[PDB]
Amino acid sequence: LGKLQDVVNQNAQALNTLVKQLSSNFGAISSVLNDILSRLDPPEAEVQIDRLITGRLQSLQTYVTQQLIRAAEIRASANLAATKMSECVLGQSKRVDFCGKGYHLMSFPQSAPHGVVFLHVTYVPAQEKNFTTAPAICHDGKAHFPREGVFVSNGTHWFVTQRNFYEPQIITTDNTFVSGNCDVVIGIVNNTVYDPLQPELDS
Amino acid sequence: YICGDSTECSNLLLQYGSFCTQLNRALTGIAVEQDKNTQEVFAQVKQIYKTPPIKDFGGFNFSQILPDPSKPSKRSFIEDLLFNKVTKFNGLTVLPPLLTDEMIAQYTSALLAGTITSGWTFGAGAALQIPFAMQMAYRFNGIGVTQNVLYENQKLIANQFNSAIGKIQDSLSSTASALGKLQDVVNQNAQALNTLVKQLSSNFGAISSVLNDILSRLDPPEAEVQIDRLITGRLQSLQTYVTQQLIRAAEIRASANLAATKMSECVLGQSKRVDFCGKG
Amino acid sequence: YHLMSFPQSAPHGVVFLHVTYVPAQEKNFTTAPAICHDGKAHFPREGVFVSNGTHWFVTQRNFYEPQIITTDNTFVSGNCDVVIGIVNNTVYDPLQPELDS
Amino acid sequence: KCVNFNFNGLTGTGVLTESNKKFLPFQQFGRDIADTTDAVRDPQTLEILDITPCSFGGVSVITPGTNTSNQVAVLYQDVNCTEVNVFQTRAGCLIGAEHVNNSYECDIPIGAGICASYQTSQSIIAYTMSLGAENSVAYSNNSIAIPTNFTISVTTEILPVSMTKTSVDCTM
Ligand SMILES: *[C@@H]1O[C@H](CO)[C@@H](O[C@@H]2O[C@H](CO)[C@@H](O)[C@H](O)[C@H]2NC(C)=O)[C@H](O)[C@H]1NC(C)=O
Ligand SMILES: *[C@@H]1O[C@H](CO)[C@@H](O[C@@H]2O[C@H](CO)[C@@H](O)[C@H](O)[C@H]2NC(C)=O)[C@H](O)[C@H]1NC(C)=O
Ligand SMILES: *[C@@H]1O[C@H](CO)[C@@H](O[C@@H]2O[C@H](CO)[C@@H](O)[C@H](O)[C@H]2NC(C)=O)[C@H](O)[C@H]1NC(C)=O
Ligand SMILES: *[C@@H]1O[C@H](CO)[C@@H](O[C@@H]2O[C@H](CO)[C@@H](O)[C@H](O)[C@H]2NC(C)=O)[C@H](O)[C@H]1NC(C)=O
Ligand SMILES: *[C@@H]1O[C@H](CO)[C@@H](O[C@@H]2O[C@H](CO)[C@@H](O)[C@H](O)[C@H]2NC(C)=O)[C@H](O)[C@H]1NC(C)=O
Ligand SMILES: *[C@@H]1O[C@H](CO)[C@@H](O)[C@H](O)[C@H]1NC(C)=O
Ligand SMILES: *[C@@H]1O[C@H](CO)[C@@H](O)[C@H](O)[C@H]1NC(C)=O
Ligand SMILES: *[C@@H]1O[C@H](CO)[C@@H](O)[C@H](O)[C@H]1NC(C)=O
Ligand SMILES: *[C@@H]1O[C@H](CO)[C@@H](O)[C@H](O)[C@H]1NC(C)=O
Ligand SMILES: *[C@@H]1O[C@H](CO)[C@@H](O)[C@H](O)[C@H]1NC(C)=O
Ligand SMILES: *[C@@H]1O[C@H](CO)[C@@H](O)[C@H](O)[C@H]1NC(C)=O
Ligand SMILES: *[C@@H]1O[C@H](CO)[C@@H](O)[C@H](O)[C@H]1NC(C)=O
Ligand SMILES: *[C@@H]1O[C@H](CO)[C@@H](O)[C@H](O)[C@H]1NC(C)=O
């Protein structure tokens, strides 16, 4: 809870400092205001009290200025929080590392004293395999490309698969789009691409 | 700053109560949040990724933006240009950053080595190697440009990227005003410090602004009057400086949060936010 | 759901007229994660599976527009058994009547 | 050497040194931007002396928690150890910590790439911080790593929103 607890600590420390400053005499004979008033007639007391006023007012202006700058921090955090409410609770955030590390799924707000906590549920991928890969794939002169995802091979066989989770799909005109012909594509690989229609017509 | 080496003055600053301790706290929170800003911005990557020996990124040429082992501190070429373009004894000090500029350059190189070799993936999972030609075909897909428009233009795009990097070197070499933002942050801080220092030359109504003049000329019953004005004026100047610095620190923190967000969304990601990561 | 905005100036400010799509006339439907056909769990490519009661449809998510379910609105995965809350149906083959014809 | 001084009634404290500052025959003193005296002509031998500050720097006490140990280390900020186990950092002279060649993640930050921790008979070590484990991403023009599996994280984020609604009647 270091963030919220430090905000509570900061505010309490600001108040406790402002409170302690009542005891600081600012060059007046005493810091107990009623003591000055019960010691001194106004010809004398007004100088002493005016030193206390000048000190206390300067301390108060200080505290309020600190609180205005801190309120700007808190308000920037509140607008940030309201945005995570709007984008991650009421929605899903496409924005990398805005709502938790990983690809964001959802967030559950849990209230906390003078703040909010988001349980940012995030998909994080975690068990890789290495594969041989290609930008595109020649069939008969045509360079095929993956519609969604990526081309890969285990070694002997080529597959298309999603970007974010290995799922070897057999390569077919359903998951591939043609563009032009092989020659312009640096690093194209041969393969074959399945015709998902002709074996039905043959059958 | 207020009372340097005078006990006679240092006592009177205790009648002004807690002020010095909360000014030190305020400047300490400012100082600490610069390390925080720096780690929020750069330390978004948990491992120092590094580049391979063989730089065969499909025709793209990062040699100007990756480190060169020839460098004494392993900045890139362009980090060297940027470091060339951009440009005290009175209780004032400057604390070092936690990260040295070599650490910063090792992190920018990690972020960059991830970004080159692994796409967005090093932001989410572990860094996944992916060929740079194939990474750009995703980034074309990620702005609705159907990705054959990359490979069928691969050389042309490589030459445009390479040349555009070269124009950055020329612009940065020639045009010292390009760094006007950073140079203004530096200039503002230096101007504020020079102002803070110059306020030690100011009487504020005391018979001198050099404290030892008052203490060499005057006994305490008199000198307390004069030194209260120097305390008051110097303290009011210090509060002024610290308040300008707190507000400036909020502006820098907003800029850090913005940088951290471009780091996340556009280095570690690609951003769909129109005109957030450069026009286009 | 945001569409576009028109800026209008105002004294020391700006005003945006944020044109937004807001949906506003709900219908309740019986729904499923996926549809079993011949062993395969079909899923909607975009949209959701629904039924008025007796007939199953796929519809885009944000405006009820019933589409008859075919191979072309859908993607296969695996087979039925793993899927909690799957429902049966048929799923149409848009080649089959052309191939017979 | 750091001394108190008085030239003609100008008092101060500092390291007086011989200087290259070419005073013209009429000048007696030279001044800093701060109005403090930066150089002087000695009133019996008309050579020019710089006056420079007796060295100073913040005493940053590094400590593990008292809920762990009473052992402590001191960063004297900026100073050279010649003026003050002992070690020297770009941040200052570091005393009572033990320098270590191994690079750990940062525990207590000290500055200029130095961090400290309480470790193995234990001592406060100080070290050049690891920026995390160094990793060659296994790049090649035809190699890709695809994740075969996930973990559903529940990373938890904890934002201030309000702060406690104080008010103060300034009259009272
Ligand atoms: C690459 O993946 C393919 C498909 O999963 C593997 O090919 C199958 O191998 C088994 C025997 O191990 C056969 O029963 C299947 O009929 C094969 N399918 C096809 C389409 O040929 C292949 O073994 C894998 N190769 C490597 C090197 O991992
Ligand atoms: C992909 O396969 C084709 C054949 O289907 C290869 O083309 C042959 O390449 C040799 C050497 O250049 C020529 O002698 C033949 O005449 C080519 N045949 C045809 C029909 O073009 C091609 O080289 C392969 N390319 C890759 C990148 O694997
Ligand atoms: C990558 O770009 C750099 C410059 O941005 C190229 O370096 C120059 O290469 C020529 C020889 O081809 C040398 O004569 C120059 O002195 C180099 N310039 C500098 C500043 O080092 C480099 O050749 C490019 N490499 C590739 C593979 O594109
Ligand atoms: C669910 O929707 C279907 C399709 O609109 C309805 O089926 C049609 O019903 C009308 C008479 O109400 C017939 O003329 C059509 O021939 C039917 N079409 C088909 C494909 O069968 C169905 O009645 C609706 N059911 C409910 C409970 O709303
Ligand atoms: C979906 O339809 C299939 C048949 O087309 C159902 O499978 C039969 O279910 C009964 C009762 O469980 C079994 O006795 C039969 O042996 C099953 N036949 C086959 C081929 O598996 C299936 O239960 C239906 N699904 C649901 C959710 O009702
Ligand atoms: C992938 O294979 C290379 C072979 O050189 C190896 O260095 C690397 O560690 C492997 N990566 C993973 C995630 O297994
Ligand atoms: C990959 O790099 C090697 C040399 O490092 C080169 O021989 C090969 O042709 C390249 N292949 C692709 C697909 O880019
Ligand atoms: C949906 O059906 C249930 C039946 O109990 C009802 O409670 C609910 O209000 C209905 N909603 C709409 C929008 O028709
Ligand atoms: C829905 O939930 C009820 C219990 O709440 C359960 O009996 C039923 O089988 C479930 N149906 C589906 C299709 O998941
Ligand atoms: C200091 O006194 C000596 C004689 O004791 C004399 O020679 C010297 O000139 C004096 N210094 C100056 C500045 O005249
Ligand atoms: C603090 O000390 C108590 C025992 O006095 C122990 O239970 C607790 O785990 C300690 N916490 C830390 C952070 O060392
Ligand atoms: C430290 O101080 C001595 C003089 O005491 C000096 O000779 C030495 O060069 C200094 N070392 C560094 C690295 O500053
Ligand atoms: C650090 O490493 C060197 C060898 O490079 C070794 O001689 C030295 O004793 C080590 N110092 C410490 C404090 O570990």
Side-chain angles (χ1 to χ4, degrees), chain A residues 154-172:
Chain A
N154 59 356
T156 50
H157 298 95
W158 283 90
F159 308 125
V160 52
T161 172
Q162 321 173 30
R163 311 190 209 296
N164 289 325
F165 184 95
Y166 184 45
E167 183 165 46
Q169 300 167 249
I170 298 301
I171 301 167
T172 167

PDB file of all heavy atoms in Angstrom, chain A residues 154-172:
ATOM      1  N   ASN A 154       8.334 -25.923 -37.396  1.00  0.00           N
ATOM      2  CA  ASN A 154       9.086 -26.754 -36.461  1.00  0.00           C
ATOM      3  C   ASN A 154      10.455 -27.172 -37.037  1.00  0.00           C
ATOM      4  O   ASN A 154      11.450 -27.219 -36.321  1.00  0.00           O
ATOM      5  CB  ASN A 154       8.182 -27.928 -36.037  1.00  0.00           C
ATOM      6  CG  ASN A 154       7.675 -28.850 -37.140  1.00  0.00           C
ATOM      7  OD1 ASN A 154       7.893 -28.649 -38.330  1.00  0.00           O
ATOM      8  ND2 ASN A 154       7.019 -29.903 -36.688  1.00  0.00           N
ATOM      9  N   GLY A 155      10.525 -27.421 -38.341  1.00  0.00           N
ATOM     10  CA  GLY A 155      11.733 -27.782 -39.066  1.00  0.00           C
ATOM     11  C   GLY A 155      11.401 -28.361 -40.434  1.00  0.00           C
ATOM     12  O   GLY A 155      11.854 -27.868 -41.458  1.00  0.00           O
ATOM     13  N   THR A 156      10.564 -29.391 -40.459  1.00  0.00           N
ATOM     14  CA  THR A 156      10.150 -30.083 -41.694  1.00  0.00           C
ATOM     15  C   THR A 156       8.856 -29.559 -42.315  1.00  0.00           C
ATOM     16  O   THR A 156       8.622 -29.803 -43.495  1.00  0.00           O
ATOM     17  CB  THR A 156       9.980 -31.587 -41.426  1.00  0.00           C
ATOM     18  OG1 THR A 156       9.170 -31.797 -40.290  1.00  0.00           O
ATOM     19  CG2 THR A 156      11.318 -32.259 -41.164  1.00  0.00           C
ATOM     20  N   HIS A 157       7.994 -28.879 -41.551  1.00  0.00           N
ATOM     21  CA  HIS A 157       6.651 -28.487 -41.992  1.00  0.00           C
ATOM     22  C   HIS A 157       6.323 -27.050 -41.626  1.00  0.00           C
ATOM     23  O   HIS A 157       6.535 -26.645 -40.493  1.00  0.00           O
ATOM     24  CB  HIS A 157       5.627 -29.411 -41.346  1.00  0.00           C
ATOM     25  CG  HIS A 157       5.784 -30.849 -41.721  1.00  0.00           C
ATOM     26  ND1 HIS A 157       6.484 -31.800 -40.993  1.00  0.00           N
ATOM     27  CD2 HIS A 157       5.250 -31.431 -42.819  1.00  0.00           C
ATOM     28  CE1 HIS A 157       6.338 -32.947 -41.670  1.00  0.00           C
ATOM     29  NE2 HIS A 157       5.610 -32.751 -42.769  1.00  0.00           N
ATOM     30  N   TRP A 158       5.794 -26.269 -42.560  1.00  0.00           N
ATOM     31  CA  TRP A 158       5.402 -24.880 -42.335  1.00  0.00           C
ATOM     32  C   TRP A 158       3.941 -24.752 -41.906  1.00  0.00           C
ATOM     33  O   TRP A 158       3.061 -25.414 -42.448  1.00  0.00           O
ATOM     34  CB  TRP A 158       5.665 -24.078 -43.610  1.00  0.00           C
ATOM     35  CG  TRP A 158       7.092 -23.721 -43.856  1.00  0.00           C
ATOM     36  CD1 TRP A 158       8.005 -24.439 -44.538  1.00  0.00           C
ATOM     37  CD2 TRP A 158       7.808 -22.567 -43.354  1.00  0.00           C
ATOM     38  NE1 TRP A 158       9.220 -23.796 -44.508  1.00  0.00           N
ATOM     39  CE2 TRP A 158       9.164 -22.668 -43.739  1.00  0.00           C
ATOM     40  CE3 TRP A 158       7.435 -21.452 -42.594  1.00  0.00           C
ATOM     41  CZ2 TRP A 158      10.123 -21.745 -43.336  1.00  0.00           C
ATOM     42  CZ3 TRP A 158       8.382 -20.491 -42.222  1.00  0.00           C
ATOM     43  CH2 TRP A 158       9.730 -20.652 -42.566  1.00  0.00           C
ATOM     44  N   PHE A 159       3.680 -23.837 -40.982  1.00  0.00           N
ATOM     45  CA  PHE A 159       2.385 -23.504 -40.425  1.00  0.00           C
ATOM     46  C   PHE A 159       2.237 -22.006 -40.335  1.00  0.00           C
ATOM     47  O   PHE A 159       3.207 -21.313 -40.073  1.00  0.00           O
ATOM     48  CB  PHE A 159       2.261 -24.055 -39.006  1.00  0.00           C
ATOM     49  CG  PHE A 159       2.586 -25.516 -38.866  1.00  0.00           C
ATOM     50  CD1 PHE A 159       3.559 -25.920 -37.948  1.00  0.00           C
ATOM     51  CD2 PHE A 159       1.951 -26.462 -39.682  1.00  0.00           C
ATOM     52  CE1 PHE A 159       3.941 -27.263 -37.894  1.00  0.00           C
ATOM     53  CE2 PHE A 159       2.337 -27.804 -39.636  1.00  0.00           C
ATOM     54  CZ  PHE A 159       3.350 -28.197 -38.753  1.00  0.00           C
ATOM     55  N   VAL A 160       1.018 -21.506 -40.461  1.00  0.00           N
ATOM     56  CA  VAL A 160       0.662 -20.192 -39.922  1.00  0.00           C
ATOM     57  C   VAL A 160       0.204 -20.358 -38.486  1.00  0.00           C
ATOM     58  O   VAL A 160      -0.208 -21.436 -38.087  1.00  0.00           O
ATOM     59  CB  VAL A 160      -0.319 -19.443 -40.822  1.00  0.00           C
ATOM     60  CG1 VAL A 160      -1.547 -20.246 -41.196  1.00  0.00           C
ATOM     61  CG2 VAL A 160      -0.801 -18.112 -40.260  1.00  0.00           C
ATOM     62  N   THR A 161       0.318 -19.330 -37.674  1.00  0.00           N
ATOM     63  CA  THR A 161      -0.065 -19.353 -36.264  1.00  0.00           C
ATOM     64  C   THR A 161      -0.371 -17.957 -35.802  1.00  0.00           C
ATOM     65  O   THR A 161       0.110 -17.004 -36.396  1.00  0.00           O
ATOM     66  CB  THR A 161       1.059 -19.933 -35.425  1.00  0.00           C
ATOM     67  OG1 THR A 161       0.803 -19.795 -34.055  1.00  0.00           O
ATOM     68  CG2 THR A 161       2.381 -19.225 -35.610  1.00  0.00           C
ATOM     69  N   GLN A 162      -1.115 -17.789 -34.723  1.00  0.00           N
ATOM     70  CA  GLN A 162      -1.334 -16.475 -34.139  1.00  0.00           C
ATOM     71  C   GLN A 162      -0.013 -15.837 -33.732  1.00  0.00           C
ATOM     72  O   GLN A 162       0.965 -16.537 -33.510  1.00  0.00           O
ATOM     73  CB  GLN A 162      -2.218 -16.564 -32.899  1.00  0.00           C
ATOM     74  CG  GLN A 162      -3.381 -17.553 -32.947  1.00  0.00           C
ATOM     75  CD  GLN A 162      -4.024 -17.604 -31.577  1.00  0.00           C
ATOM     76  OE1 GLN A 162      -4.032 -16.645 -30.825  1.00  0.00           O
ATOM     77  NE2 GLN A 162      -4.609 -18.701 -31.187  1.00  0.00           N
ATOM     78  N   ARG A 163       0.015 -14.520 -33.559  1.00  0.00           N
ATOM     79  CA  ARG A 163       1.204 -13.842 -33.026  1.00  0.00           C
ATOM     80  C   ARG A 163       1.459 -14.221 -31.566  1.00  0.00           C
ATOM     81  O   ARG A 163       2.599 -14.388 -31.167  1.00  0.00           O
ATOM     82  CB  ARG A 163       1.105 -12.305 -33.150  1.00  0.00           C
ATOM     83  CG  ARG A 163       0.686 -11.732 -34.515  1.00  0.00           C
ATOM     84  CD  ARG A 163       0.876 -10.206 -34.573  1.00  0.00           C
ATOM     85  NE  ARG A 163      -0.059  -9.519 -35.484  1.00  0.00           N
ATOM     86  CZ  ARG A 163      -0.197  -9.616 -36.790  1.00  0.00           C
ATOM     87  NH1 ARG A 163       0.579 -10.358 -37.519  1.00  0.00           N
ATOM     88  NH2 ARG A 163      -1.142  -8.964 -37.387  1.00  0.00           N
ATOM     89  N   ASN A 164       0.412 -14.321 -30.753  1.00  0.00           N
ATOM     90  CA  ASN A 164       0.525 -14.307 -29.290  1.00  0.00           C
ATOM     91  C   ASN A 164       0.309 -15.653 -28.585  1.00  0.00           C
ATOM     92  O   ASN A 164       0.289 -15.696 -27.360  1.00  0.00           O
ATOM     93  CB  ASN A 164      -0.391 -13.195 -28.756  1.00  0.00           C
ATOM     94  CG  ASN A 164       0.141 -11.810 -29.069  1.00  0.00           C
ATOM     95  OD1 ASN A 164       1.334 -11.562 -29.075  1.00  0.00           O
ATOM     96  ND2 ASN A 164      -0.708 -10.847 -29.298  1.00  0.00           N
ATOM     97  N   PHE A 165       0.172 -16.749 -29.322  1.00  0.00           N
ATOM     98  CA  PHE A 165      -0.010 -18.084 -28.777  1.00  0.00           C
ATOM     99  C   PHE A 165       0.205 -19.121 -29.868  1.00  0.00           C
ATOM    100  O   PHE A 165      -0.456 -19.064 -30.890  1.00  0.00           O
ATOM    101  CB  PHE A 165      -1.431 -18.194 -28.243  1.00  0.00           C
ATOM    102  CG  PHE A 165      -1.741 -19.503 -27.563  1.00  0.00           C
ATOM    103  CD1 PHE A 165      -1.620 -19.603 -26.171  1.00  0.00           C
ATOM    104  CD2 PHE A 165      -2.188 -20.603 -28.312  1.00  0.00           C
ATOM    105  CE1 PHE A 165      -1.944 -20.801 -25.532  1.00  0.00           C
ATOM    106  CE2 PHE A 165      -2.520 -21.799 -27.665  1.00  0.00           C
ATOM    107  CZ  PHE A 165      -2.384 -21.901 -26.277  1.00  0.00           C
ATOM    108  N   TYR A 166       1.124 -20.059 -29.708  1.00  0.00           N
ATOM    109  CA  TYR A 166       1.424 -21.027 -30.746  1.00  0.00           C
ATOM    110  C   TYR A 166       0.208 -21.885 -31.002  1.00  0.00           C
ATOM    111  O   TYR A 166      -0.323 -22.525 -30.104  1.00  0.00           O
ATOM    112  CB  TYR A 166       2.618 -21.908 -30.385  1.00  0.00           C
ATOM    113  CG  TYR A 166       3.053 -22.891 -31.461  1.00  0.00           C
ATOM    114  CD1 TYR A 166       3.163 -22.490 -32.801  1.00  0.00           C
ATOM    115  CD2 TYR A 166       3.385 -24.210 -31.112  1.00  0.00           C
ATOM    116  CE1 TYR A 166       3.624 -23.387 -33.781  1.00  0.00           C
ATOM    117  CE2 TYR A 166       3.843 -25.115 -32.086  1.00  0.00           C
ATOM    118  CZ  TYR A 166       3.983 -24.694 -33.421  1.00  0.00           C
ATOM    119  OH  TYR A 166       4.476 -25.540 -34.359  1.00  0.00           O
ATOM    120  N   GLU A 167      -0.227 -21.917 -32.243  1.00  0.00           N
ATOM    121  CA  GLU A 167      -1.334 -22.726 -32.692  1.00  0.00           C
ATOM    122  C   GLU A 167      -1.076 -23.051 -34.148  1.00  0.00           C
ATOM    123  O   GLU A 167      -1.373 -22.239 -35.011  1.00  0.00           O
ATOM    124  CB  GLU A 167      -2.638 -21.957 -32.469  1.00  0.00           C
ATOM    125  CG  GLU A 167      -3.841 -22.812 -32.860  1.00  0.00           C
ATOM    126  CD  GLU A 167      -5.134 -22.219 -32.308  1.00  0.00           C
ATOM    127  OE1 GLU A 167      -5.329 -21.000 -32.429  1.00  0.00           O
ATOM    128  OE2 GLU A 167      -5.954 -22.981 -31.763  1.00  0.00           O
ATOM    129  N   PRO A 168      -0.437 -24.175 -34.465  1.00  0.00           N
ATOM    130  CA  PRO A 168      -0.064 -24.468 -35.828  1.00  0.00           C
ATOM    131  C   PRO A 168      -1.306 -24.780 -36.647  1.00  0.00           C
ATOM    132  O   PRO A 168      -1.907 -25.839 -36.525  1.00  0.00           O
ATOM    133  CB  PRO A 168       0.904 -25.643 -35.735  1.00  0.00           C
ATOM    134  CG  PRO A 168       0.464 -26.362 -34.467  1.00  0.00           C
ATOM    135  CD  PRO A 168       0.021 -25.215 -33.574  1.00  0.00           C
ATOM    136  N   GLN A 169      -1.691 -23.854 -37.499  1.00  0.00           N
ATOM    137  CA  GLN A 169      -2.751 -24.026 -38.470  1.00  0.00           C
ATOM    138  C   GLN A 169      -2.113 -24.426 -39.791  1.00  0.00           C
ATOM    139  O   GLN A 169      -1.150 -23.806 -40.215  1.00  0.00           O
ATOM    140  CB  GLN A 169      -3.534 -22.713 -38.600  1.00  0.00           C
ATOM    141  CG  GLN A 169      -4.193 -22.214 -37.303  1.00  0.00           C
ATOM    142  CD  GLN A 169      -4.670 -20.771 -37.419  1.00  0.00           C
ATOM    143  OE1 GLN A 169      -4.152 -19.851 -36.812  1.00  0.00           O
ATOM    144  NE2 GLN A 169      -5.678 -20.502 -38.206  1.00  0.00           N
ATOM    145  N   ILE A 170      -2.631 -25.446 -40.460  1.00  0.00           N
ATOM    146  CA  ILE A 170      -2.179 -25.804 -41.801  1.00  0.00           C
ATOM    147  C   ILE A 170      -2.372 -24.618 -42.730  1.00  0.00           C
ATOM    148  O   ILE A 170      -3.330 -23.863 -42.588  1.00  0.00           O
ATOM    149  CB  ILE A 170      -2.946 -27.018 -42.339  1.00  0.00           C
ATOM    150  CG1 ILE A 170      -2.733 -28.270 -41.474  1.00  0.00           C
ATOM    151  CG2 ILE A 170      -2.604 -27.337 -43.802  1.00  0.00           C
ATOM    152  CD1 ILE A 170      -1.278 -28.739 -41.341  1.00  0.00           C
ATOM    153  N   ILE A 171      -1.473 -24.425 -43.687  1.00  0.00           N
ATOM    154  CA  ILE A 171      -1.486 -23.232 -44.533  1.00  0.00           C
ATOM    155  C   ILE A 171      -2.436 -23.454 -45.709  1.00  0.00           C
ATOM    156  O   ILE A 171      -2.341 -24.453 -46.408  1.00  0.00           O
ATOM    157  CB  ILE A 171      -0.059 -22.849 -44.957  1.00  0.00           C
ATOM    158  CG1 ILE A 171       0.831 -22.581 -43.733  1.00  0.00           C
ATOM    159  CG2 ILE A 171      -0.101 -21.576 -45.792  1.00  0.00           C
ATOM    160  CD1 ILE A 171       2.312 -22.496 -44.066  1.00  0.00           C
ATOM    161  N   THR A 172      -3.355 -22.527 -45.942  1.00  0.00           N
ATOM    162  CA  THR A 172      -4.443 -22.633 -46.918  1.00  0.00           C
ATOM    163  C   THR A 172      -4.863 -21.245 -47.400  1.00  0.00           C
ATOM    164  O   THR A 172      -4.700 -20.263 -46.685  1.00  0.00           O
ATOM    165  CB  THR A 172      -5.645 -23.375 -46.309  1.00  0.00           C
ATOM    166  OG1 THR A 172      -6.784 -23.236 -47.109  1.00  0.00           O
ATOM    167  CG2 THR A 172      -6.025 -22.873 -44.925  1.00  0.00           C
TER     168      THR A 172
END
